[PDB]
Design a protein around this nucleic acid. Structure first.
Lengths: 69, 117, 27, 157, 97
RNA sequence: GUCGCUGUAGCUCAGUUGGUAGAGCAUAGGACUGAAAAUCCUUGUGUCAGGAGUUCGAUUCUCCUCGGCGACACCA
RNA sequence: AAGGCGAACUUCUGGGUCAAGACUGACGCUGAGUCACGAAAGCGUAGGGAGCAAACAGGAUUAGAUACCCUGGUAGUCUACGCUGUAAACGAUGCACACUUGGUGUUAACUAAAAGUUAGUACCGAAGCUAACGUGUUAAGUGUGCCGCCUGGGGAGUAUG
């Protein structure tokens, strides 16, 4: 239950910057957007397949560009 | 005419609406406000500006309950939740904590099905 | 594969199943 | 698409009665048919009539203030995102401010009911000076129509 | 609007004329309220018929269709069917929301 | 016959223990979309059913009616 | 072995891997019928039913919308037992053995650990192979054992038994 205690002299701005950062580092919003509505285990597996393939092609691409240069 | 001093502000910020409730430390509600009640309707109800207006109106409702000391609770993925907290600050009522109560299940209650089958 | 052949098989299967559904409950 | 247009002429700051560019621009907006002399005469006579309807010596002052009473601040420009058209507010630029003002006064004066040339336009000019009439009505309408739809102000691209 | 049937180097049998009309009533339930004009040009040039259909939409779209054939009835059937299908496609273009 | 009431914008509805004549819908105009829709904005729409009295002035306060009401009791 | 298997614990229980670490001494491979298992959906009996959700109802989009979208919603989804034995049940590649350059990760074990080996598991890739795509020590390379299966498309996985 992500909390950010605001000090007496601490500013609201950085206070909610800390809140935003540790929310993002708990990944609450991404989890909620993931659980909005159901997905077949098949399609979870397939999207992970494709994401990893995209990552591999992009990395090979990046290294090719680095050596091409 | 009552004095409480301490209090809580709950803010639900979903994709469709924003609801701001001002309540005791015990949780008993003092007042509330909503984007739908603030005259907006349609996609306006979820813009950050509407969230700001809704929150500040909710607090203006409770100017005279003798409170300057609130705990902020947030749930929902709405865009302008930061705007809700920012407006609570802008009104001058000081905050002592900011929290989230967004419910994260441990995998129960199979959710709705996808859109565009 | 082009997939036209798979589509042909699909429509064939649908027609056969429809025939069987029609003639179910008949006696 | 290839932006940064060539530098405008801008050299016509009318060297006839006031050495002022804004009067020249107003006369140009006034023009029909390609008749600069007619426009200049009508505008000069009309502003003189205004300055003696309000009985002040400095005509520049009253003319400029009656313009600035109509120059708007925020207007509505339509964009569309995701197959949804949104009438986002956006702050005008100063040149567009004079343009919209002069256009509004000119349209109201032309479409009004009056006897004559400078008659119509001087009458409209003092109505603007007093912050009332068709031109001021249109200006405030645009203003608070933009303000009634300020939710989408975060679309300024 | 109502459709304009023009002909070049040919003579209109009333049979084929009301054939064309009978093929064109397909528009005045769905498409008529969306178009400016619908022209149908028949030509007879190389012992064959050449048909040019043309439609203008209220939102700036222009549809044209050209075909050749040997028998007027068959050519009209194919050309009008193609025209109606393309018009439906454009209407759906715009109404997809 | 009696009781509880109402009549205010074209419709619906406020109306403040007396000094506002409006709210929502709709109508008309501008803007938006390709139209129809939905925003958004302007704009009209009144002896506030009639009369007497109370007040310094009355939609409002009282009373007497006009027309329409809901509900109750008799009905040879 | 495949289907498949993810909160925690116990009980019952199957399989694999490594080694000088002794024993048996070819006791093996594959396998027509046959038998067992076999996602999900479905069926019978008896329970359970939060959420989700065929059929179905209403509201919208549309010329129409028996759909996509929205609000609801019965079977079903769950448990016990008994049936059905079908999937793009896929690595679209049957199983087993003897061989045939490497690069970069990773799991387990041996080693205190590195470092290497062995048994897996991924990416790239030499030769070779391939109609091409690609494959390439987890071959679709070089050899064989046995089983299953194919012989133009539609009719047709139909008619009939």
């Amino acid at each position: 239950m992500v909390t950010v205690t605001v000090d007496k002299n601490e500013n609201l701005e950085k206070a909610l910057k800390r809140f935003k950062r540790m929310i993002e580092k708990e990944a609450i919003i991404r989890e909620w957007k993931r659980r909005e509505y159901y997905e077949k285990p098949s399609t979870i597996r397939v999207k992970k397949e494709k994401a990893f393939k995209r990552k591999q092609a992009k990395k090979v691409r990046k290294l090719k560009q680095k050596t091409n240069r | 005419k009552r004095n409480i001093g301490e209090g809580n502000v709950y803010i639900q910020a979903t994709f469709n609406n924003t609801i701001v409730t001002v309540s005791d430390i015990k949780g008993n509600a003092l007042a509330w406000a909503s984007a739908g009640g603030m005259g907006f309707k349609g996609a306006k109800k979820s813009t950050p500006y509407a969230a700001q207006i809704t929150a500040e109106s909710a607090l203006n409702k409770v100017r005279d309950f003798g409170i300057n000391y609130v705990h902020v609770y947030i749930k929902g993925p709405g865009i302008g939740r930061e705007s809700a907290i920012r407006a609570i600050g802008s009104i001058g009522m000081t905050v002592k904590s900011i929290s989230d109560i967004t419910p994260i299940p441990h995998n129960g209650c199979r959710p709705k099905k996808t859109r565009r089958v | 594969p082009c997939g036209r052949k798979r589509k042909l098989k699909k429509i064939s299967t649908h027609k056969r199943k429809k025939k069987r559904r029609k003639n179910r409950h008949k006696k | 698409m290839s932006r940064k247009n060539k530098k405008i002429k801008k050299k016509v700051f009318v060297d006839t009665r006031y050495n002022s560019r804004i009067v020249a621009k107003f006369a140009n907006r006034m023009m029909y048919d390609g008749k600069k002399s007619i426009s200049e005469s009508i505008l000069y006579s009309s502003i003189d009539l205004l300055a003696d309807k309000l009985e002040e010596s400095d005509k520049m002052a009253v003319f400029y203030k009656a313009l600035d009473n109509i120059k708007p601040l925020v207007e509505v420009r339509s964009r569309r995102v995701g197959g949804a058209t949104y009438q986002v507010p956006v702050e005008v630029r100063e040149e567009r401010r004079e343009a919209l003002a002069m256009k509004w006064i000119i349209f109201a004066a032309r479409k009004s009911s009056g006897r004559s040339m400078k008659e119509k336009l001087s009458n409209e000019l003092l109505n603007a000076y007093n912050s009332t009439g068709a031109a001021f009505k249109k200006k405030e309408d645009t203003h608070r129509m933009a303000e009634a739809n300020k939710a989408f102000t975060h679309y300024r691209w | 609007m109502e459709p304009k049937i023009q002909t070049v180097n040919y003579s209109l049998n009333e049979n084929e004329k009301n054939f064309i009309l009978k093929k064109l009533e397909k528009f005045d339930t769905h498409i008529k309220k969306h178009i400016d004009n619908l022209k149908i040009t028949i030509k007879k040039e190389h012992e064959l018929f050449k048909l040019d259909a043309h439609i203008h939409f209220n939102w700036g779209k222009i549809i044209h269709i050209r075909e050749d054939g040997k028998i007027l009835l068959n050519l009209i059937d194919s050309a009008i069917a193609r025209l109606y299908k393309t018009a439906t496609k454009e209407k759906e273009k715009k109404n997809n929301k």
